[PDB]
């Protein structure tokens, strides 16, 4: 504004930002899906107490005693 | 199946291959860049060299001990998840059905055959296997020519060249008369 005052060639009456007056899932809805929550804390506390024993569950290209099984020990 | 398991090896190594033409190349390696050892667990613990195979393109393809690790399944059928007893024990079961006197002959009379049996110390490893299987003072002797394929072809070349072979073959009209069950009588 003071610059506009001090500058003679600068005219006025200008709506500066000239603009355009602009004015302003289904898979679950199938005949066969059953999307169910496991109730994370419920199933978690359930399987949580179920201890799991392991004893060197080792398998990668390991030769000796052909059959192997993960979580070897018991708990 | 061993080669298919080697395609499994490929995916574990990172070789993204799933074609039968690629499978041919795997078989070319199988017959070419694939051997046997005699020590399973020992060589398993032993550090390999990762034999770099080269494609027709020439791409570096390391192997490792997988070349003899995959035929361990031929002796350890459960590696693919298939209950059996291994070539050695199955043959020992065949020995069990024979008789002690005839068994010694068969220890001396071992006819290894098939191109699949072509490996470094294949029969030698198997010798050690059966030595751990067969009792003491048992002289095991293997017979395995270099043509474990054409041995059948030449055997048919001889058998087919016989005059008594008339009865051995089946005439065309014979099957055309009644049926193959006659030949099934002839096949036993």
Structure tokens at A21: 């007056």
Residue A66 sits at the chain B interface (C-beta within 8 Å): yes
Q: With helix as H, strand as E and coil as C, how does chain B read?
A: CHHHHHHHHHHHHCCCCCCHHHHHHHHHHHHCCCCCCCCHHHHHHCCCCCCCEECCCCCEECCCCHHHHCCHHHHCHHHCCCCCCHHHHHHHHHHHCCCHHHHHHHHHCEECCCHHHCCCCHHHHHHHHHHHHCCCCCCCCEECCCCCCHHHHHHHHHHCCCCCHHHHCCCHHHHHHCCCHHHHHHHC
Q: Within this chain, do residues B92 and B66 fall inside the same structural domain, yes or no?
A: no
Looking at the structure, do residues B97 and B64 belong to the same domain, yes or no?
A: no
List the resolution, Å.
8.2
Which residue in chain B has the smallest CA separation from A59?
B79
A66, B79 contact by CB (below 8 A)? yes
Measured in angstroms, the CA of B155 and the nearest CA of chain A are apart by: 38
Taking CA B99 as the corner, what is the angle to CA B98 and CA B101, rounded to the nearest 5 degrees? 135
**Cα distance between residue B30 and residue B92, in whole Å:** 27
Question: Is the minimum CB–CB distance between B65 and chain A shorter than 8 Å?
Answer: yes
Yes or no: say if A51 and A36 are a contact pair by the CB < 8 Å rule: no
- Beta-carbon count within 10 A of B65 CB: 21
Measured CA distances, B61 to A39, B33, B114 (Å): 48, 10, 27
Specify whether B90 is located in the same domain as B77: no
Partners of A64 on chain B (C-beta within 8 Å) are 40-41, 44
**What's the angle, vertex CA B118, arms to CA B132 and CA B81, rounded to 5?**
65
Which of B68, B73, B75, B79 shows the shortest CA–CA distance to B30? B68
Residue B78 contacts A, CB cutoff 8 Å: yes
3-state secondary structure of A70: coil
CA–CA gap between residue B125 and residue B49 (Å, rounded): 21
* Residue B16 sits in the same domain as residue B94: no
Q: What is the CA radius of gyration of chain B?
A: 21
Domain CATH code at residue B58: 3.90.640.10
B1 and B76 part of one domain: yes
Taking the Cβ of residue A58 and every Cβ of chain B, the question of whether any pair is shorter than 8 Å is answered with no
Same domain, B114 and B98: yes
CATH of the domain at B135: 3.30.420.40
Q: Which domain holds residue B130?
A: 85-151
Q: Are residues B64 and B138 in the same domain?
A: no
- Based on the domain organization, do B92 and B68 belong to the same domain? no
Question: Could you give the CA distance from residue A17 to residue A52 in angstroms, rounded to a whole number?
Answer: 68
Do B110 and B146 fall into the same domain? yes
Residues B22 and B78 reside in one and the same domain: yes
Q: CA nearest A60 in B: which residue?
A: B12
B66 plus B100 within the same structural domain: no
Q: Do B130 and B120 fall into the same domain?
A: yes
Only one residue has tokens 């041995």, namely B151
């Amino acid at each position: 504004d003071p610059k506009y005052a001090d500058l003679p060639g600068i005219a006025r009456n200008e709506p500066d930002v000239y603009e355009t007056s602009d004015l302003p899932q289904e898979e679950l809805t199938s005949t066969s899906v059953e999307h169910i929550i496991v109730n994370p804390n419920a199933a978690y506390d359930k399987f949580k107490d179920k201890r799991v024993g392991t004893k060197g569950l080792d398998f990668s290209d390991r030769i000796g005693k052909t059959k192997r099984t993960g979580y070897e020990s018991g708990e | 199946d061993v080669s298919r398991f080697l395609r499994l090896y490929l995916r574990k190594e990172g070789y993204d291959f799933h074609s039968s033409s690629e499978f041919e190349i795997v078989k070319a390696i199988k017959e070419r860049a694939c051997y046997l050892s005699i020590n399973p667990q020992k060589d398993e613990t032993l550090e390999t060299e990762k034999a770099q195979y080269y494609l027709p393109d020439g791409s570096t393809i390391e192997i490792g001990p997988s070349r003899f690790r995959a035929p361990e399944l031929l002796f350890r059928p459960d590696l693919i998840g298939e209950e059996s007893e291994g070539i050695h024990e199955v043959l020992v079961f065949a020995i069990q059905k024979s008789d002690m006197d005839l068994r010694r002959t068969l220890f001396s009379n071992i006819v290894l055959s098939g191109g699949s049996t072509l490996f470094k110390g294949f029969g030698d490893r198997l010798l050690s296997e059966v030595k751990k299987l067969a009792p003491k003072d048992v002289k095991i002797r293997i017979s395995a020519p270099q043509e474990r394929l054409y041995s059948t072809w030449i055997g048919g070349s001889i058998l087919a060249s016989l005059d008594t072979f008339k009865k051995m073959w089946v005439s065309k009209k014979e099957y055309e008369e009644d049926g193959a069950r006659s030949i099934h009588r002839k096949t036993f």
